Structure formats: structure tokens, C-alpha cells
Amino acid sequence: QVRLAQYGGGVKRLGATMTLSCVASGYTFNDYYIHWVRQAPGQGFELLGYIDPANGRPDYAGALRERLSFYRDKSMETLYMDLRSLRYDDTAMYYCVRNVGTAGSLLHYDHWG
Amino acid sequence: ENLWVTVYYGVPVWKEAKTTLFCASDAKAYETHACVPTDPNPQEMVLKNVTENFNMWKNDMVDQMHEDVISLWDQSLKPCVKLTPLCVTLNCTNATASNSSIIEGCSFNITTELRDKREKKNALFYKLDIVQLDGNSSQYRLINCNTSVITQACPKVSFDPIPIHYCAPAGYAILKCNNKTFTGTGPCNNVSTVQCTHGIKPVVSTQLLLNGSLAEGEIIIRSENITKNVKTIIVHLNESVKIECTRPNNKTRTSIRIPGQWFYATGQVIGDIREAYCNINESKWNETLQRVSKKLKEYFPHKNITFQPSSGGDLEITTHSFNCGGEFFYCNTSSLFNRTYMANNSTRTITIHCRIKQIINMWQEVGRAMYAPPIAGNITCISNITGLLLTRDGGKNNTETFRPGGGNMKDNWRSELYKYKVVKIEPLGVAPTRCKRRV
Amino acid sequence: NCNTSVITQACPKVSFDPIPIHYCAPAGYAILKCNNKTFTGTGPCNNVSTV
Amino acid sequence: TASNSSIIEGMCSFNITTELRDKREKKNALFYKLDIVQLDGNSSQYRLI
Amino acid sequence: VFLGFLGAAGSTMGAASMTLTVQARNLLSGIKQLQARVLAVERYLRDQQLLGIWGCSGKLICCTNVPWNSSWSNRNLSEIWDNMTWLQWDKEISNYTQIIYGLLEESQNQQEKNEQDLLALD
Amino acid sequence: VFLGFLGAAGSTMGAASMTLTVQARNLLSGIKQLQARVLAVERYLRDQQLLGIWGCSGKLICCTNVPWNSSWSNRNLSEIWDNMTWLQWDKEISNYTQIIYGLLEESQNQQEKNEQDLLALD
Amino acid sequence: VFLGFLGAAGSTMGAASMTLTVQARNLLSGIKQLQARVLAVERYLRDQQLLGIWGCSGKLICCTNVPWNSSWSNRNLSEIWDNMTWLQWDKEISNYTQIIYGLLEESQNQQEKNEQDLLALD
Ligand SMILES: *[C@@H]1O[C@H](CO)[C@@H](O[C@@H]2O[C@H](CO)[C@@H](O[C@@H]3O[C@H](CO[C@H]4O[C@H](CO[C@H]5O[C@H](CO)[C@@H](O)[C@H](O)[C@@H]5O)[C@@H](O)[C@H](O)[C@@H]4O)[C@@H](O)[C@H](O[C@H]4O[C@H](CO)[C@@H](O)[C@H](O)[C@@H]4O)[C@@H]3O)[C@H](O)[C@H]2NC(C)=O)[C@H](O)[C@H]1NC(C)=O
Ligand SMILES: *[C@@H]1O[C@H](CO)[C@@H](O[C@@H]2O[C@H](CO)[C@@H](O[C@@H]3O[C@H](CO[C@H]4O[C@H](CO[C@H]5O[C@H](CO)[C@@H](O)[C@H](O)[C@@H]5O)[C@@H](O)[C@H](O)[C@@H]4O)[C@@H](O)[C@H](O[C@H]4O[C@H](CO)[C@@H](O)[C@H](O)[C@@H]4O)[C@@H]3O)[C@H](O)[C@H]2NC(C)=O)[C@H](O)[C@H]1NC(C)=O
Ligand SMILES: *[C@@H]1O[C@H](CO)[C@@H](O[C@@H]2O[C@H](CO)[C@@H](O[C@@H]3O[C@H](CO)[C@@H](O[C@@H]4O[C@H](CO)[C@@H](O)[C@H](O)[C@H]4NC(C)=O)[C@H](O)[C@@H]3O)[C@H](O)[C@H]2NC(C)=O)[C@H](O)[C@H]1NC(C)=O
Ligand SMILES: *[C@@H]1O[C@H](CO)[C@@H](O[C@@H]2O[C@H](CO)[C@@H](O[C@@H]3O[C@H](CO)[C@@H](O)[C@H](O)[C@@H]3O)[C@H](O)[C@H]2NC(C)=O)[C@H](O)[C@H]1NC(C)=O
Ligand SMILES: *[C@@H]1O[C@H](CO)[C@@H](O[C@@H]2O[C@H](CO)[C@@H](O[C@@H]3O[C@H](CO)[C@@H](O)[C@H](O)[C@@H]3O)[C@H](O)[C@H]2NC(C)=O)[C@H](O)[C@H]1NC(C)=O
Ligand SMILES: *[C@@H]1O[C@H](CO)[C@@H](O[C@@H]2O[C@H](CO)[C@@H](O)[C@H](O)[C@H]2NC(C)=O)[C@H](O)[C@H]1NC(C)=O
Ligand SMILES: *[C@@H]1O[C@H](CO)[C@@H](O[C@@H]2O[C@H](CO)[C@@H](O)[C@H](O)[C@H]2NC(C)=O)[C@H](O)[C@H]1NC(C)=O
Ligand SMILES: *[C@@H]1O[C@H](CO)[C@@H](O[C@@H]2O[C@H](CO)[C@@H](O)[C@H](O)[C@H]2NC(C)=O)[C@H](O)[C@H]1NC(C)=O
Ligand SMILES: *[C@@H]1O[C@H](CO)[C@@H](O)[C@H](O)[C@H]1NC(C)=O
Ligand SMILES: *[C@@H]1O[C@H](CO)[C@@H](O)[C@H](O)[C@H]1NC(C)=O
Ligand SMILES: *[C@@H]1O[C@H](CO)[C@@H](O)[C@H](O)[C@H]1NC(C)=O
Ligand SMILES: *[C@@H]1O[C@H](CO)[C@@H](O)[C@H](O)[C@H]1NC(C)=O
User: Fold this and answer.
1) What is the dihedral of CA C19, C25, C26, C32, to 10 degrees?
2) Cβ density class G61-95: b for 16+ within 10 Å, e for less
3) In 3-state terms, what secondary structure has residue B316?
4) For B69, phi and psi rounded to 5 degrees?
5) CB burial class (10 A; 0-12, 13-18, 19+) of residue D2?
6) Chain E residues in contact with F62 (beta carbon < 8 A)
7) Which of these, B160, B197, B278, B380, could form a disulfide with B166 (CB 3.0-4.6 Å)?
8) Among all ligands shown, which has an atom nearest to the Cα of A7?
9) Is D38 helix (H, G, I), strand (E, B) or coil?
10) Where is this region: V2 (chain D) (predicted)?
């Protein structure tokens, strides 16, 4: 039922800003946190950060706090992320993934985009 | 030998469950509360030698409180006027008052009492309530009109934190715990029961909860303990730190006809422009944050603790939001939380600027908007801060960083329905005994 | 009345009219009654009945 | 604007007031002419059934 | 009038038998919370009828004809009757409450039918 | 628990008297179907009270003091007591159900007042 | 059947005891008056339970073990049971019922425990 479509990609020029996107669908938008993980070629997965869709609160990994920026649009059920000043080693496939958040804690991802 | 089945009724034994609960309060005011008539007077008995389990994160009555508050607000907004006709294109330049940039409000057309006649009007709006239309920047529009319909709050119906007592139904008992160092989980060796909870005030605020209760011992830090990746950490003060706020300007209400419904705009601002602000006792805040840090670094023993302001999100979470009277506030709290601590009596006052807006999205949800009518004159307010809604940042690698949050309204009432728990009495039980029944 | 309130046309077929109505008490309550011929609507009746 | 218009024949434009209550736009979409009934006079005018 | 109620909880099964009447009297009294009263009434009538079927009519304490049996709780409860409170014994005996009721029901049926047969000699 | 409800229906008036507890047990459990629960409670309480008025309190089978007037259906049901005939007997005796209850009620009144007078000798 | 419901009202406390059964049977039967139906059931169940707690189960008339205590109504009624009416007596005796009920409850508790102890000799 639930599907997390994505857009944006292709080739982004060195040093330029880029902006992916996500679209929620068959679930209550407010109840599930969203994360943004990436896989460089020849590397294991790593997390960048997560955005609470309801209130919009983000949180980023330590090494990429300056460059990243997350924001959403509740009416369209859309999410975004911007990674300013792309470096060469940003070559990766960027997945948006849902999170099964409990009443007071966060847990395993279930539905990858 | 000669041990036979026997059965007992009225036995003191119970099992946990979930059920409906009753609204209760004193004599009803304003001719959040809608339940009449009742007169509660609870009595508390200590269940001697009773050890009982508790959990604040799992109990259901918080959800019941949440649903009841939302439904009460819906019923309050149900008869009030809808502001649909105001959606037309506003033409605004706003160069009248001394400070045009602060408010930046417009003139618009409206259909008068005769449906064939349209009349020009004009009113004052904060530009947080207004978004520029594409093209020429003089055009403007209400912020939420393209996403939802806006309902004006009825001015006479001024809901407020009226205390509420939640009374169990017959056959269920609201348990209670008063262990002086209970952290929201694990057994309580000091238990009691009552018909009705104390008077819970349905307060609405973000980044900290005010007009609350105070703990018994020192400051209590409550958190979920399934994993270190927690959503929100609740800190409950044992010593209130007073906060004062004011809106010095004298606002002028005005009425615009819509049938008999009237739309209450801000006609004019009287008095020189001064931005809204608040005050905090500096020494008290310093000592409170120091005590909080000392308590908090017990859980996280080998790391520095640093406080920093919130990041991203709406105004409801980037700034402390609350309401005093019939107005809503959004106060920049960057100066308060900017602190750090090493790992190893109202002398001075802090001041924080603040912004107020009228069109409130219903805090929990988007797609339904509230419009606050302007409160005329000038406002002053005083309240008692009693707790903090913190939330930590992961992945910092040997430097903790707690920053305020708490946009979700449920965490406010999960702190005040903290003691209680509901159980189902199982009065019937069996046992062996000597017996005979005549035949 | 347009500038003061909304106006609803009465449904022509639904002709509400003075049709007799009987008010009955629920179980556990009894409707008392008085048939003193000179009763002014107040004071004690020494001629009482129930229905 | 298709190979077979007779099958559906709504292919119809209308002036909808949208998102401002003060502006109108000439939208158009498809309709089966079972859902559509001709208005009197000029046969090009139509209406929802 | 509510008072004490579960205050006897935590005490022994012997002492707690005194305050049973105080606990038995609890049938007291948006806006649509009327359903709670109906739920409470239904629960109370369930308990009252279920006591009636076994021949334990009305009286809060009774003993029935069916003897105690092994394969149920084989505790030495006689001395422990005045040590444990009701909760732990209830937890222990919860494994078998669903079973005993049929035995009690059939015992009451036999009792009533034998008495009716005795009176049938008229 | 639901099992064998009306399973013996139609059987003998001697045999089906065993399984009366199964019938007695049923007080179980748009969107506004709550009213059926109140209906069931009302009917059950009506029957329970009406059994209590005649002195036939609680116990599922009982006999009362009022003798059998032969005018009530004149049947030699003793032969037919062991031959099916439940619903047929109900139809047969439906002519007189409305009459018997007053007699039973007055008999219970007389019994209660006589017993009170007997105890009044204290 | 509703008939002669309060016809005995106003009569003497002796005669009125005959027609108690006629009063006892009253549990009969906008648009949302279902709450009125629920109220009668609640009150009737309250009265029925409260009679059960004292050991006056079911029967419309009983006496109990607690004597006529000191204080309370010294007003003579044995000479007046064949006079006066219940409404006049209720006004006098209303000052002490809330006190009397606890005594009756405790007396019934003592009776039940004594009987259980007597049967415990098995
Ligand atoms: C009711 O009104 C609201 C308010 O106008 C409507 O909401 C708007 O919807 C549109 C479309 O859904 C959005 O446009 C998109 O914007 C994307 C990028 O974001 C914009 O805002 C950024 C501001 O962010 C700032 O803060 C963050 C941190 O919080 C920083 O990271 C950031 O740098 C800024 O500091 C700007 O930075 C940015 O430049 C944009 O202005 C665009 O990427 C997106 O483009 C895609 O989609 C287009 C078509 O939709 C397409 O043409 C493009 O090619 C590309 O594919 C798009 O332009 C608005 O952002 C959004 N408004 C707000 C305020 O968020 C709402 O739709 C309307 N209706 C309903 C039913 O609600
Ligand atoms: C919906 O429509 C209704 C109907 O039009 C609107 O109701 C009108 O509201 C206005 C304003 O609220 C009222 O005007 C005021 O009238 C005052 C005096 O009364 C007028 O009517 C009198 C009629 O009385 C007759 O009967 C009595 C006995 O019963 C006799 O004694 C009397 O002589 C008459 O025979 C007239 O006598 C009188 O002359 C008026 O015509 C005015 O004093 C008042 O003055 C204004 O201006 C003052 C400066 O000059 C200023 O100081 C005041 O404050 C005020 O501004 C004003 O004109 C209408 O009377 C009233 N209509 C009716 C029929 O009563 C209603 O407002 C509208 N909207 C809504 C939401 O309902
Ligand atoms: C908990 O927080 C609240 C506020 O967040 C604190 O209580 C507030 O205290 C101020 C004064 O210090 C009150 O202000 C006055 O309230 C009265 C209420 O009547 C106002 O009078 C009139 O009220 C009606 C509504 O009933 C309104 O329509 C009128 O416009 C208004 N004015 C006039 C002239 O009639 C009066 O004007 C002030 O506004 C707040 O009302 C009061 N808030 C609440 C919710 O009680 C409180 O101190 C704090 N808790 C503790 C322990 O301090
Ligand atoms: C609360 O108040 C603080 C100040 O006490 C605000 O912080 C300040 O925000 C402004 C925003 O314009 C920052 O200026 C901008 O900085 C960026 C670079 O980050 C620059 O590109 C812009 O041109 C502009 O100069 C300012 O640096 C910042 N100062 C500090 C000390 O943080 C904060 O934004 C306020 N928050 C809210 C919610 O109102
Ligand atoms: C939170 O508190 C810290 C600690 O006081 C603040 O640090 C201050 O950060 C500013 C830059 O944002 C530093 O500014 C200085 O400006 C001068 C003139 O432009 C420049 O020559 C210096 O090199 C420096 O950049 C300031 O020195 C620094 N102060 C300290 C004591 O470290 C921080 O700004 C506070 N943030 C908020 C949001 O309140
Ligand atoms: C309110 O409505 C009037 C009437 O439509 C607007 O009148 C303007 O009239 C001039 C006359 O030449 C036109 O050129 C303008 O285009 C009209 N304005 C618009 C927006 O169409 C008046 O401007 C309207 N005012 C507001 C605030 O909407
Ligand atoms: C509250 O605590 C703050 C933070 O320590 C104090 O601010 C510092 O005050 C000292 C002098 O007292 C200055 O040298 C620092 O520059 C100030 N800022 C910081 C970040 O240290 C403040 O004075 C304290 N106020 C009270 C009343 O105790
Ligand atoms: C939508 O509205 C426009 C503006 O009124 C209509 O424009 C036509 O404009 C010509 C200009 O001379 C007039 O002669 C026509 O009479 C107008 N049409 C109508 C229907 O009045 C446009 O036709 C409208 N379109 C629809 C589908 O309603
Ligand atoms: C509160 O509970 C804790 C749990 O370990 C216990 O150590 C402490 O003694 C209790 N205090 C009181 C006053 O019951
Ligand atoms: C907690 O313990 C204290 C002292 O033992 C007692 O006064 C208080 O009533 C107790 N509260 C509860 C809820 O058990
Ligand atoms: C009606 O009541 C008055 C009250 O004084 C009394 O005098 C009169 O006799 C009564 N009449 C009847 C017919 O009851
Ligand atoms: C009133 O008195 C008359 C005659 O005494 C009687 O016929 C009638 O039934 C009485 N009505 C009531 C309500 O007492």
C-alpha cells in the first residue's frame, strides 16, 4: 500500500546545489519519521539525517550538519533535502526510508523508497 | 482432607485494562470543559503492602485526554463564523504607522449585507498571517486559505486552562503512586486509589510546559528507555521559575459585517510601537539549568552536556509558543538555552523578544485553521514554568547536545497524567475450605 | 430579517399543527394530579390522583 | 481531438473559480455523453445531467 | 458511600474477607459517556447471574458441594491462607478458573434435581 | 460460552430440564446498536424479578403452593411429559399464562405474611 | 399490569403492606429518551443490591437481627401501625436510615461469617 516515490537525480555539476524530493502516499503522514540514507559505490550504507514530518524538526549527521538541509510540505505530503557544495565523493544513491516510531522511541526502518 | 471448592465475592483483586473516563469539574464557567452537572470530592487511601507496576509511556488515558481536548475544541469552533469570503486578493502597501515593517498590514473587497453590492474595507494583519502572491509584490493573500477554511473563534467563548478531574466509571479504579523518586516505569511500593484525578489544566505550550505541578524531591528527568534513540525527554522542575509577558500596545477592535455574523479585525494600534517581550529571573534560570545539567549527566556519565537552541521546523517548535488571554505568542528562546557545562535572589533579569500572530493552525494537525480575534488594549501575563521538553541530538560522538522541542501536544499531557493508572476489579475468586451443603 | 438572520421556508407538506400529546413518566416516577374544582394552580390539594 | 469522439464526446471547457474567489480559469476535461445533456438552442452548449 | 474499598488489598485472604461488603457496593451513580453506566451494569449482572447459577445466591461467602481436586493448584494454602494476599493466589489459580465453573454448574443442577425429586413424593 | 443453545429444543419436557442452564446463561457481551444491550438487560431483569415475586427466587426449577386447576387445558400431560411437546405445550397453555401469575403472586404474599406473623411471636 | 399502583398510599402502615407486590412490578417497558429507560434499571438494581447486602434477599418483607437501637425515633408506632400513613412515618424516620444501614450490613457480615465457621467444622 504505502509507496515512497522519489524524483531528481541524474548528473549534478561539481560545486552546484542539488535537491531531491519524496512523496508519501498510503499512510498517515504525521505518524512516521522519514530518514535519508545514501550508499556511495564501494561503501556500506550510512545515515545522513531524519526529518519529523508533522512539526518539521530535522536532525543531521555530525560530519554533514553545515551542508544538509531538510524541509517538507504537509499539504502535498512532500519532503525535500538540499546538499550544498557537492564534492566528488557525494556520488551515491540516496534512499528515503520510513521509520516505525513508537510512542517514545524510534526503531527499525520498514518501507524503503 | 475435606477441602472443598468455595467462592468469594467482593474480593480485592484486579487486572489492568482500558475504559472510558468521565469529565468532572467544579461549577461550570463561561456559561477547556464541557460536562455538567457534577460535584467531585475524592478520598485517597494508601494500599498498605501493595506493590504495583506502572508505565507512563504505555497507558491509554493520555490518548483519551488528547481526543477529548480535540473534540471539545471542535465543538467550540462548530457554531462560530467561517471566514471564507475574506479569501479575495488583498492589495497592500501599509505605510501608515511609524513601524510599517513590523506588521506590514491591507485593503480588500467584501460582499456587504446586500448580495449585489460589494464594499471596500481595510484592516491590520501581521505578515506571519499573510503570504505574498506571485508577480507584483503588492498583491497578498491569507496564509491558509489555499489549504483550508478559517473559522474565527467565538469571542464570548474564551476557553482557558480550567482544571479537569477525570473520574473512573463503576467497576474500575484509578490507581496512583507517590513514590518520591518514581521515573515513570517500574514498580511503585507506595500505591493509592481515588475516584477522580486532581485538577489537570489543559495547557498548550511548546519547548516547556507551564502552570504545571512540581515534583517532591529534586528535578526529575523522565525518558523512554527502550533505546537511547529517544523522541522526547521530559524534565519536571521541583522549583517554579516565574515568567512574565506583556503586549504593551493598545489595539483597537473593529467589526466587519458578513447575515448577522461579524468578523473582528484589528482596526488600529494605539500607542507607540513596542515589540512584545517577556522576562525571566536570570539567577534562577542559571541555577535551574546548572541543577538540570548535574542531574542529567548521571544518565550520560562520560560526556559533556551542551544546551543549544532548536533547529528548523515551524514557529510552533523553533520558538516557545503559548497563549495568554485571547492572544498567541511565539518568543525567541535562543538566549535562554545557549549554555555549556564541563564534564569533569532575583538579582538580574533576562529579556526575550516575542512575536504574535492571529491565524493559528490547529496545533496537532494541518488543514483546519483558527483565527484569533484581536484583544483590545494592552496585555500582561504571569505564569509558573514547571518543566522542560528536551530532545537530544544523536551521532555527536562524545559531546551530548540537548535542544528544545516538543511540537507534539501529547507530551504535555503525558507529564500531568503521569501518576495515574486504571484497572478492572475482578471481585469474584475461588479458594479451598471445609464445607457441606445439605441434600 | 435578512440583515439579522437566515430565512428557512417551511416545508409545504410537513404541516406541524396542534396535534395532542401525552407526557408519560418513566418507570420509577409517577405523575400526580389534582382535580379540586376550585384549585388556582397552587396550594395543597386534598383530592389527589395519579396517572 | 481524438480518433473517436462519438464514444465519449466530452473532450468540454468551463470557467471555474479557483483558490481566490475573485479569478476564473478555463479548465477542460473528458466526459462521457451519458453524463452530459444538451442545452436548448445552440447544440454546442451542454450541462451536467 | 465510598470508603476504604481496596484498602484491604495486600492483606491476607482471611482478613480481607471482612471488608467484602464495602467492595461489593460499587454500583454508584464529549458528553456521550452514558455507555460506561451500561457497561458497569452489564458486568455486575454477569457476576450476579454467574453466582446464581452455582447455588451461591446473594450471600458474599459460600462453599459449594464440589470437592477440591489435584491437577488444580496443589498449594498448602491452609497455613499460607494468612500469609499471601489475594493477588498472588488469584494469579496461581487463574490457570483453572475457566474449568471449575462447569463442575459447579452441574453440581447445582444435581442438587436442585435431587431436591425436586424428593419433593415429588407428595 | 455458547454451546448446545436450544440443542434439546423440541425434546421431552423430562430431558430438556437438564440443559436449562445453557438457556439461562445467555447474557453475553450504523454504529449505534448499543440499544440492543439495554433491551437484553431489560428482558433478563424482567424475568428475574418476575421469578422473585412468586417466591421462586433464583433456582431455575421450582414448584409453588397454588394447586393445578384442571380447567387449565385439562391435559393428561403426565403421559406426554416424556414425549416432545415443548412448543406444543407452550401453545396449549398460552391461553392461561396471563391468569396464573396473579394467583402465584397472592400465594407468595400470603406465605410471606404468615411467616412474618409466625416470627412476630418473639 | 399497572393498576392500583399507589392506591394504598395514605392508608395505614398495616394495610399498605398487602399491596406491596403491586408497587414492586414497576419496571415496565426529541427521540433520545433511552436514558430514561436506563435510569429505572439503575435505581431498581441499586435497591435490589442494597436489600441483598442486609440479608433481606428477594422477599418484600423481612426483619433483621439488629434491635431497635437507643436514640433514633422514640416516637411510638406500635399503637399507630394501624393508623397514620407511610409518608408521615418516612419523614420522622428519615433522620437515621443512613445510620441504620451500616448496622444492618455489619450484622449480616457477622451472620455470614458465623455460618461459614459453623460449616467449617466439616
Ligand atoms: C498553499 O500555499 C503553500 C505556500 O505557498 C504552497 O506551498 C508551496 O508548494 C510549492 C510546490 O509544492 C513549493 O515549491 C517547491 O519548492 C521546492 C524548494 O523549496 C522552496 O523553498 C525553499 C525555502 O527553504 C528555506 O529553508 C530551508 C531550511 O528550512 C533551506 O534548506 C532553504 O535553502 C531555504 O533557506 C527555497 O530555498 C527554494 O528555492 C524554493 O523556493 C522546489 O524544489 C520545488 O521545485 C520542483 O517542483 C516544481 C513544481 O512544483 C518544478 O517546477 C521544479 O522544476 C522542481 O521540480 C517547488 O518549487 C513551495 O516551497 C511551497 N511553499 C512553501 C512555503 O514551502 C501550497 O502548495 C499551496 N497549496 C496547498 C494545497 O497547500
Ligand atoms: C437590521 O435591520 C434593522 C432594521 O433597519 C436595523 O435596526 C435599526 O438599527 C439602527 C441602529 O442600531 C436604529 O437606529 C437608531 O435609532 C435611534 C432612535 O430610534 C429610531 O426609531 C424610532 C422609532 O420609534 C417609534 O416608536 C416609538 C414608540 O415605540 C416612538 O416613541 C417613536 O417616536 C417612533 O414612533 C424613531 O422615533 C427615531 O426617530 C429613530 O428613527 C436613533 O436615536 C439612533 O441615532 C443614531 O445617531 C445618533 C446621532 O444622531 C447617535 O448618537 C446614535 O448613537 C445613533 O448612532 C439610530 O438612528 C434603528 O432604529 C433600527 N431600526 C428599527 C426599526 O428599530 C438593524 O441595525 C440591522 N442590523 C442588524 C444586525 O439587526
Ligand atoms: C496560569 O496561566 C494563566 C494565564 O496563562 C494565569 O492566569 C491569568 O491571570 C491574568 C491576570 O494576572 C488574567 O487576566 C484577566 O482575566 C480576566 C478574566 O475575567 C479578564 O477579565 C475579563 O474576562 C473576560 C472573559 O471571562 C473577557 O471577555 C474580558 O475581555 C476581560 N476583561 C474585562 C475588562 O472584562 C481580565 O481582563 C484579564 O485579562 C487571566 O484571565 C488569567 N488566565 C486564566 C486562564 O485564568 C495564571 O496566573 C497562571 N497560573 C498561576 C498559578 O499563576
Ligand atoms: C532568534 O534570535 C537569534 C538572534 O538572537 C537569531 O539568530 C540570527 O538569525 C539571523 C537570521 O537572519 C542570522 O543572520 C543571517 O545569517 C546568515 C548566515 O547564517 C546570513 O547568510 C544572513 O545574511 C543573515 O545575516 C544571524 O546570524 C543569527 N545569529 C545568531 C547568533 O544565531 C535566530 O534566527 C532567531 N530565531 C527565530 C526563530 O526567530
Ligand atoms: C552562544 O554563545 C556563544 C558563546 O558566547 C556565542 O559565541 C559567539 O559567536 C560569535 C559569532 O556568532 C563570535 O563573534 C565574534 O565576532 C567578532 C566581530 O565580528 C569577531 O572578530 C570574532 O572573531 C568572533 O567571530 C563571538 O566571539 C562568540 N563569543 C564567544 C564568547 O565565543 C554564540 O554567538 C551564541 N549564540 C547565540 C545564538 O546566542
Ligand atoms: C474592489 O473592486 C473594485 C471594482 O471591481 C476594484 O476597482 C478597480 O477599478 C479600476 C477602474 O479602472 C480597475 O482598473 C481595477 O482593475 C479595479 N481593481 C481590480 C482589483 O480589479 C477595486 O480595485 C477592488 N479593490 C480591492 C482591494 O480588491
Ligand atoms: C548567568 O550565567 C551566564 C553564563 O555563565 C553569565 O554570563 C557570563 O557572565 C560572566 C561574568 O559574570 C561573563 O564574563 C561572561 O561573558 C558571561 N557569558 C558567558 C557565556 O559566560 C551571567 O552573568 C549569569 N548571571 C547571573 C545573574 O548569575
Ligand atoms: C469564460 O469567461 C470568459 C470571459 O467572460 C468568456 O469569454 C467570452 O468573451 C467574448 C469576448 O467578446 C464574449 O463575446 C463571449 O460572450 C464570452 N463568453 C461567454 C460564455 O460569455 C468565455 O466564453 C467563458 N468560457 C466559458 C467556458 O464559460
Ligand atoms: C521509591 O522506589 C525506589 C525503587 O527502587 C525505592 O528504592 C525507594 O525506596 C522508594 N521510595 C519510597 C519513599 O517509597
Ligand atoms: C507514600 O508513603 C508515605 C509514607 O510512607 C505516605 O504518607 C503516603 O500516603 C504514601 N502514598 C502512597 C500513594 O502510597
Ligand atoms: C379545594 O381546596 C380548598 C382548599 O382550601 C378546600 O377548601 C376545598 O374544600 C377543596 N374542594 C374540593 C372539592 O376538594
Ligand atoms: C375529586 O373528588 C371527587 C369527589 O370526592 C372524586 O369523584 C374525584 O375522583 C376526585 N379527584 C381526585 C383527583 O382526587
Assistant:
1) -160
2) eeeeeeeeeeeeeeeeeeeeeeebebeebeeeeee
3) helix
4) -65, -45
5) exposed
6) 116
7) B197
8) 1
9) strand
10) 12-49
- DSSP assignment letter at B153: P
What torsion, rounded to 10 degrees, do the Cα atoms F49, F54, F59, F63 define? -150
CA of B60 to the centre of ligand 5 (A): 47
Beta bridge partners of residue B194, listed in sequence order: B174
Q: CA nearest B350: which of B284, B292, B291?
A: B284
Nearest-Cα distance to chain E for F20, in Å, is: 9
Atom 70 of ligand 1, residue of closest alpha carbon = B147
Q: Which residues of B179-209 are buried (b: 16+ CB within 10 A; e: fewer)?
A: eeebebeeebebbbbbbbbbbbbbbbbbbbb
Tell me the C-alpha distance between B371 and B83, whole Å: 9
Q: Could you tell me if B203 and B161 are in contact, meaning their C-beta atoms sit under 8 angstroms apart?
A: yes
In Å, the largest CA–CA distance within chain B is: 102
Query: Sign (positive/negative) of CA torsion B76, B78, B79, B82?
Result: positive
Q: State the Cα–Cα distance between residues F57 and F61, nearest whole angstrom.
A: 10
For residue G119, the chain B residues in CB contact (below 8 A) are 434-436
* Of residues B166, B197, B208, the one with CA closest to residue B383: B208
Burial of residue A39 (number of CB atoms within 10 Å: 0-12, 13-18, 19+): middle
Q: Residue G43 corresponds to which cell in the numbers above? A: 435505581
Give Dmax (Cα) for chain F: 62
Cα–Cα dist A105/B4, whole Å: 51
Which candidate, G97, G93, G71, places its Cα nearest to that of G80? G93
Angstrom distance (rounded) from CA B231 to CA A101 = 9
Say if CB G52 and CB E58 are below 8 A apart: yes
Query: Which residues of chain B does A102 touch, with a Cβ-Cβ cutoff of 8 Å?
Result: 224, 226
- The set of chains that have 3 or more CB pairs under 8 A with B is A, C, D, E, G
CB atoms within 10 A of CB A22: 25
Out of F27, F34, F37, name the one closest to residue E49 (CB). Answer: F27
Is the sign of the CA dihedral B149, B152, B154, B157 positive or negative?
A: positive
The DSSP line for B75-99 is HHHSSSPB-GGGGSPEE-----SS-
Dist CA E89 CA E75 (whole Å)? 10
Partner E, chain B 44-63, Cβ-Cβ below 8 Å: 45-50
Chain G residues at the F interface, defined by Cβ less than 8 Å, are: 17-18, 20-21, 24-25, 27, 29, 34, 37-38, 41, 44-45, 57-63
Q: How far is it, in rounded angstroms, from Cα B275 to Cα B246?
A: 9
Ligand 8 mean position to B121 CA, how many Å?
Answer: 30
Of all atoms in ligand 11, which is nearest to the CA of residue C46?
Answer: 14
Number of other residues whose CB lies within 10 A of the CB of residue A42: 5
Question: What whole-number distance in Å separates Cα of residue B368 and Cα of residue B362?
Answer: 6
> Is-contact B352 B169, C-beta < 8 A?
no
- For residue B93, what are the CA distances in angstroms to B120, B145, B237, B253? 15, 21, 47, 21
Handedness of CA B93, B94, B100, B104 (dihedral sign): negative
- Sign, Cα dihedral of D8, D9, D13, D14: negative
Q: Which ligand is nearest to the CA of B48?
A: 10
Q: Looking at the CA of residue C37, tell me the nearest atom of ligand 11.
A: 13
Resolution (A): 3.7
C-alpha distances out from residue C24 to B113, C21, G18, G30, Å: 47, 10, 27, 14
Angle value at C-alpha E41, between E40 and E42, nearest 5 degrees = 90
Domains located in chain A, CATH noted: 1-113 (2.60.40.10)
* CA dist list (Å): B47 to A14, B174, B211, B343: 71, 13, 30, 43
What span, in angstroms and rounded, lies between the C-alpha atoms of B413 and B409? Answer: 7
Task: Say which residues have a Cβ less than 8 Å from residue B54's Cβ, sequence separation at least 6.
Answer: B177, B182, B184, B185, B186, B187, B188, B421
